[PDB]
Ligand binder design. Structure first.
Ligand SMILES: Nc1ncnc2c1ncn2[C@@H]1O[C@H](COP(=O)(O)OP(=O)(O)O)[C@@H](O)[C@H]1O
Ligand SMILES: [Mg+2]
Lengths: 50, 535
């Protein structure tokens, strides 16, 4: 019974590894996590996040 | 397995670079690029001749233009070309200091790679050390926004005189610093101020001397009047000092639809009716201007031979073949609106100009239009002269960089003292934190602190001073005394204080020097396999 917002944050920081974001992941993860929440949970699109 | 071995197409032109020798080649290559502009850093810096394949030559010391329009091969130095372009676009100043600082981070990291430390672990310490340097300089950064507009005007002069000392414009910094500051003041809001650089225009002219350059508020047009015999100067009569300038996108031409059309005329009767038709159009076009009281009319397409003299009898000057972009910049300074059609012409859309005269240059045949405003207007225009075509173009980039420093103080009033004072202040802050934490990251912190010391040692080397005696003197006054104003003096004054020398630099310009240099070298250390295809 945890929070749904913190669930997407820990999973997003994993993909940030091996990239240039690993050091800056503090600021950058807070972006993409808020990007998926704007989209509808039923319909997720990769063209809108362009 | 047979002799032919093929996986990736074109294996002959594609070469693979790998190993410890790969890091040694790309780091030492980036140093040769900074070594060229190393002597160009500071007011003692020297220019660089750039030859284009078409034969045009350009002489500039700005690292953004030097790296631009230059033939390169290695991809590491091409990243430095985009590095100076990143510093030039947003900030507009400091393109030379970033490339020198970026190569200094690689030279200090090259010795750390041979010690057995992973390249990313070297780059991970640079990001943590860069945050401690910015936080230290921000604490000692003075805020000039607490003063009034009187002291704020002199604060913009301190920032302009510093950037103009490294160019050919450095002959007189006092006279040309007003041209950069006063051009910005006209577009400033006086509250929550934004620069809006689009309103500022720069038009160069090749001839005369650079001392003849003066700030003129208005629009510069190179298009001569439609008829030669109209008076060169236009002055208002009695009251209403505005000249009622009219800007129309539709010239004087026989009315026709844009689509393809065909007009069928029957014998003599309809042939004579259309004759009077157009003869009444010229009389209708001239009465609209006289009804609204307009004087000068400008348009994209040239007037007809019958429309040229029709405006002369009514004492109505006109200019033809004006570009579309030039039409828009005129209506802003005149507080007018461009009239789309002859039926919409009204006195509310007419412009206002204090004086307009026809400029002539030497024995060459040209006519330059000069619009002037007796009061503060929305736009400004830079008028630059020079004895050489390249000096004019160099004075453009020198004045452009000065306008980029002034606009940095408009958004962020926080400024720092440059000339070796800011680099040493941020360098000693990292060295103090390296001995406290110890660990395996103490070597990455010392390499970042020694890389920041390359900038003040470069300014002292180009000025003739001893880099050993200069660097040791700065660390003595910075550690003992909390005043960070002590920095490298390239001109040789008896005092090392940067505050008494009126040397002021924007904080957003110096902050991006470490940010752009640290983020670039982190990717360079992450590059192992290098595949270069021959062209
Ligand atoms: N008169 C001066 N006194 C002290 N330092 C100066 C002076 N003029 C320039 N500098 C220093 O030289 C450095 C380089 O400035 P400049 O060559 O004008 O542009 P860029 O930063 O693009 O190279 C700046 O960081 C500045 O601190
Ligand atoms: Mg500069």
């Amino acid at each position: 019974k945890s929070s749904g917002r913190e669930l997407l944050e820990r999973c997003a920081r994993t993909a940030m590894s091996s990239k240039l974001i690993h050091n800056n992941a503090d600021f950058f993860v807070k972006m993409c996590v808020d990007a998926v929440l704007s989209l509808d949970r039923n319909d997720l699109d990769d063209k809108l996040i362009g | 397995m047979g002799r032919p071995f093929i996986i990736v197409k074109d294996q002959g032109n594609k070469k693979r670079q790998h190993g410890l020798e790969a890091k040694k080649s790309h780091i030492l290559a980036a140093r040769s690029v900074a070594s060229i502009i190393k002597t160009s850093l500071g007011p003692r810096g020297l220019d660089k001749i750039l030859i284009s394949p078409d034969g045009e030559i350009t002489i500039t010391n700005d690292g953004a233009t030097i790296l631009s329009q230059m033939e390169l091969d290695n991809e590491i130095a091409k990243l430095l070309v985009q590095l100076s372009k990143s510093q030039d676009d947003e900030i507009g100043d400091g393109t030379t200091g970033v490339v020198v600082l970026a190569s200094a981070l690689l030279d200090q990291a090259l010795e750390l790679i041979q010690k057995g430390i992973h390249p990313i672990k070297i780059a991970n310490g640079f990001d943590e050390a860069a945050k401690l340097a910015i936080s230290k300089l921000e604490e000692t950064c003075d805020d000039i926004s607490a003063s009034n507009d009187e002291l704020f005007r002199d604060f913009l002069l301190r920032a302009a005189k510093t950037s103009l000392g490294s160019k050919i414009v450095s002959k007189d910094h006092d006279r040309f610093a007003e041209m950069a500051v006063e051009a910005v003041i006209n577009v400033m809001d006086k509250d929550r101020k934004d620069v809006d650089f689009d309103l500022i225009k720069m038009q160069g002219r090749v001839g005369g001397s650079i001392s003849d350059s003066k700030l003129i508020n208005g629009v510069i047009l190179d298009k001569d009047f439609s008829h030669p015999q109209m008076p060169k100067c236009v002055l208002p009569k009695e009251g209403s000092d505005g000249v009622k300038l009219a800007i129309l996108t539709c010239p004087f031409e026989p009315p026709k639809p844009k689509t393809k059309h065909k007009l069928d005329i029957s014998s003599v009767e309809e042939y004579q009716k259309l004759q009077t038709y157009e003869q009444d159009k010229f009389k209708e076009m001239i009465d609209d201007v006289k009804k609204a009281g307009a004087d000068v009319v400008i348009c994209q397409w040239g007037f007809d031979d019958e429309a040229n003299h029709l405006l002369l009898q009514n004492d109505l000057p006109a200019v033809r073949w004006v570009g579309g972009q030039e039409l828009e910049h005129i209506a802003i300074s005149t507080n007018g609106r461009i009239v789309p059609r002859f039926q919409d012409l009204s006195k509310d859309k007419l412009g206002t100009c204090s004086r307009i005269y026809e400029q002539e240059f030497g024995t060459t045949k040209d006519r330059m239009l000069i619009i002037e405003q007796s009061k503060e207007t929305k736009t400004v225009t830079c008028f630059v002269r020079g004895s050489n075509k390249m000096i004019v173009d160099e004075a453009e980039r020198a004045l452009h960089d000065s306008l980029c420093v002034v606009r940095n103080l408009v958004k962020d009033s926080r400024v720092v003292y440059g000339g070796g004072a800011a680099e040493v202040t941020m360098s000693l802050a990292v060295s103090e934190e390296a001995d406290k934490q110890r660990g395996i990251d103490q070597y990455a912190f010392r390499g970042f602190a020694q890389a920041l010391d390359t900038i003040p040692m470069t300014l002292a080397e180009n000025s003739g001073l001893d880099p050993i005696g200069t660097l040791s003197t700065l660390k003595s006054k910075q550690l003992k005394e909390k005043i960070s104003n002590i920095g490298v003096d390239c001109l040789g004054y008896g005092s090392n204080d940067m505050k008494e020398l009126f040397v002021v630099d924007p904080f957003i310009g110096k902050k991006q020097q470490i940010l752009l240099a640290t983020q670039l070298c982190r990717m360079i250390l992450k590059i192992d396999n290098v595949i270069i295809s021959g062209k």
